[PDB]
Design a protein around this ligand. Structure first.
Ligand SMILES: Nc1nc2c(ncn2[C@H]2C[C@H](O)[C@@H](COP(=O)(O)NP(=O)(O)OP(=O)(O)O)O2)c(=O)[nH]1
Ligand SMILES: [Mg+2]
Ligand SMILES: [Mg+2]
Length: 430
DNA sequence: CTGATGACGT
DNA sequence: ACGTCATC
């Protein structure tokens, strides 16, 4: 009771851009605004692979990982923007630069951890303490929270979603003001106020909309964010967790969407995150290991300690291209030409990285997939990255993987390559 | 027919 | 160092 930690020590947000690559293209081309729209890579094969979908288009059933030709069957009026292609491959530069615009705005409010091209965690604990003292015991107006949902409310003794959002918010606030909630609840609420301000700054200064989750840790904040997309933010309190997790499929929690989550379901014979509370920490550790068992024991109670890392920039700079089926690379000259294309993009991005960020990569990682191998990576090899030179980098990459070629002929490559990947890593101050 | 990231185990 | 998982 009195000594049991509840994981309510921090206020953490996760801000994620709505259909990000789509918004980037809609900003640039107003003809695409407020329309069923998707972003695709390439065009010749099946119209290209969709990687981002506007909410108007999702209503037609259009999704990520769908071929545009198939999407067009669901949504005949679907508008498409294609990712820039340079040196024969997809080039994501425009989106990476748009990301930087957003991350820089977020960094004005608090320490952020860049978690992907379009989202970042924010530790608002300090900022919340600051705002609380400034407030002097003022109540918090619903007006300060115009886009916030409180997960789990309204409850207890209007048929439109905004009415529901407001009713839940009023119940939450009415309980704060009357002292029926906790200090952590107040801290989350102020966190949500700050997140409203951050999301407003982002939209004013970039044109992009985002959603956000506000809770006590990264996992709950990430889960909260997805609850009311697009263009809304969600507060998940410690108190909301039991009901939230009681029907929450295990795969929905970050990190349990793959093999581990499937083993939890199969071994334990359960379906929902809440059902995990019925196992001792030792039981969970027995099945899933010491680290995972401890994590699961705490997580199913809404508790998680992973810190928001102070990291605004990516740790790695990489590029890759797949060569599936017939297109797989079967000659040495082919392998070298494509390694050069990758190396040149890499050099451009690295040179720019060095000027912007005062650091240099010191390691080059080379990864390939061989034809007939199910694995994402067949082989990974590294060498020193001592110079930002595309020809040297491509030559070095070839040197590290050339032993893989089992073909007898000098000029031929077997088994054929279905993937090439170059990644610059191990950055040092410059 | 995708192109990335970051984390962890050994 | 190298392989694998997770996310999308
Ligand atoms: N190259 C590549 N880019 C991708 C892929 N998947 C996603 N992206 C890119 C395109 C995405 O726009 C972006 C951000 O990823 P999310 O946040 O996961 N999806 P979004 O922001 O689109 O919608 P939502 O409102 O649902 O958050 O990353 C992929 O498989 N390949
Ligand atoms: Mg997003
Ligand atoms: Mg995202």
């Amino acid at each position: 009771g009195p000594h049991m930690a509840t994981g309510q020590d921090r206020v953490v947000a996760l801000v994620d851009m709505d259909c990000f690559f789509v918004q980037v293209e809609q900003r640039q081309n107003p003809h695409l605004r407020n329309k069923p729209c998707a972003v695709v890579q390439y065009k010749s094969w099946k119209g290209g692979g969709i990687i981002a979908v506007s909410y108007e288009a999702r209503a037609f059933g259009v999704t990520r990982s769908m071929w545009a030709d198939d999407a067009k069957k669901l949504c005949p009026d679907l508008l498409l923007a294609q990712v820039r292609e340079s040196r024969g491959k997809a080039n994501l530069t425009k989106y990476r630069e748009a990301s930087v615009e957003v991350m820089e705005i977020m960094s004005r409010f608090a320490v952020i951890e860049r978690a992907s091209i379009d989202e970042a965690y924010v530790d608002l604990t300090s900022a919340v303490q600051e705002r609380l003292q400034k407030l002097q015991g003022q109540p918090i107006s619903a007006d300060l929270l115009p886009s916030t949902y409180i997960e789990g409310l309204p409850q207890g003794p209007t048929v439109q979603k905004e009415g529901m959002r407001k009713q839940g918010l009023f119940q939450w606030l009415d309980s704060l003001q009357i002292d029926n909630l906790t200090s952590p609840d107040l801290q989350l609420t102020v966190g949500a106020v700050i997140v409203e301000e951050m999301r407003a700054a982002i939209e004013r200064e970039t044109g992009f909309q985002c959603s956000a989750g506000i809770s006590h840790n990264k996992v709950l904040a990430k889960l909260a964010c997805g609850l009311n997309k697009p263009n809304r933010q969600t507060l998940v309190s410690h108190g909301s967790v039991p009901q939230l997790f009681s029907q929450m499929p295990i795969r929905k929690i970050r990190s349990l969407g793959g093999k581990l989550g499937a083993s939890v379901i199969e071994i334990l014979g359960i379906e929902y995150m809440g059902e995990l509370t019925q196992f001792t920490e030792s039981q969970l550790q027995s099945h899933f290991g010491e680290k995972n068992g401890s994590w699961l024991y705490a997580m199913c109670r809404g508790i998680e300690h992973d810190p928001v890392k102070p990291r605004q920039l990516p740790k790695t700079i990489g590029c890759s291209k797949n060569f599936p089926g017939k297109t797989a690379l079967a000659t040495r000259e082919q392998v070298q030409w494509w390694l050069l294309q990758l190396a040149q993009e890499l050099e451009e991005r690295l040179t720019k990285d060095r000027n912007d960020n005062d650091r240099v990569a010191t390691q080059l990682v080379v990864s390939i997939r061989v034809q007939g191998d199910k694995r994402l990576s067949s082989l990974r090899r590294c060498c020193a990255l001592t110079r930002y030179d595309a020809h040297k980098m491509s030559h070095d990459a070839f040197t590290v993987i050339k032993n893989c070629n089992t073909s007898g002929i000098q000029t031929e490559w077997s088994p054929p390559l279905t993937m090439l990947f170059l990644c610059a890593t191990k950055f040092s101050a410059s």
